[PDB]
Paper text:
Poxviruses express a dual specific phosphatase (H1) that de-phosphorylates signal transducer and activator of transcription 1 (STAT1) and blocks interferon signal transduction. H1 is conserved in poxviruses and is essential for virus replication in cell culture. Due to the importance of H1 in modulating interferon-signaling and viral replication, it serves as an attractive anti-poxvirus drug target.
To understand the mechanism for monkeypox H1 catalyzed dephosphorylation and provide an accurate structural model for drug discovery, we determined a crystal structure of H1 to 1.8 Å resolution. Monkeypox H1 has 171 amino acid residues and the refined model includes residues 2–171 with well-fitting electron density. Two H1 molecules are related by crystallographic symmetry and form a domain swapped dimer, which resembles a butterfly. The H1 active site consists of a Cys-Arg-Asp catalytic triad. The arginine residue (Arg116) of this loop captures the phosphate ion, whose guanidinium group interacts with two phosphate oxygens through two hydrogen bonds with the distances of 2.9 and 3.0 Å, respectively. There is a phosphate ion captured at each active site, representing the final stage of catalysis before the product is released. The first hot spot is the dimer interface, which is unique among the members in the protein tyrosine phosphatase (PTP)/dual-specificity phosphatase (DSP) family.
Residue numbers in the entry:
A (entry chain A), B (entry chain A): 2 to 171
Amino acid sequence: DKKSLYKYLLLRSTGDMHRAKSPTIMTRVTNNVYLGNYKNAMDAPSSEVKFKYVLNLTMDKYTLPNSNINIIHIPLVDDTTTDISKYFDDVTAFLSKCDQRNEPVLVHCVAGVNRSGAMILAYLMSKNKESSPMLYFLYVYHSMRDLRGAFVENPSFKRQIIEKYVIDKN
Amino acid sequence: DKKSLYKYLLLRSTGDMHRAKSPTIMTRVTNNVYLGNYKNAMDAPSSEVKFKYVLNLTMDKYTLPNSNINIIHIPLVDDTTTDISKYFDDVTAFLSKCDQRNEPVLVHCVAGVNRSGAMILAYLMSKNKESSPMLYFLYVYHSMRDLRGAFVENPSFKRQIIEKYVIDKN
């Protein structure tokens, strides 16, 4: 319902947010795209999800030595100010292909909140063309944060998302 | 700037709000409409503003015995759940006339935050037809709150505003 949706988003946007809680388990974001922390990445070969890809956004190249997973490494510095905007289109195009091929992919960083959360937020914004960008940003942000406990908490990352995906009509 | 505006509103809406601070001084909201607490109402006859009206939303009828001010009394119960929506159109039509006649009016309650703040928020929403209601609600709410320190903190009042002024396009 529009009335329930607007009440939810605007109360969340004017003072009613939960304290941030560190996510521990993997979240299915779309049909094939998943969001997680570093433990979730270590557990990916053992997951019932038949992951074809893991997108590793940490600084460290790792291997999953007994796994057929293709680990794509895009190192993002562990900083509250990382230039993630340079990677938005490359990452969302990759995630869109995974959804188009039904090739499950886990996007992760260390805590599964900021670097990986921001790329998931970018992907969802890029997949939207029905809802106004402002409304959709507030909906995705608050509903993902309620689900995960913490989601793109870094103000610089939110700012970069806003500047990329919310300034233009869509 | 659209980019600066969206950054401001959406960062305020996703976790970056100040602690609530009780307002002490009167705020000029429009050309003729002012917002204040109970002390501001007591001080209204002495104000350099030549108030023609005071809108008293407290439960108590008072007089300003050495003053030509017309005190309009609409008692609103001191409750977090008061049905303010019944009074929206009556109050905003009255405030709109004060602006049309250049007849200054002070809207006040006890703390100048919730009952009076909500009627000011309703009035500003009713005066808007250019900006989308969602965007304008977030702009007025956060900018008034930053100015006053506390502004429509009661969730029931925000909900009633949202249901009245934000659900429809405008």
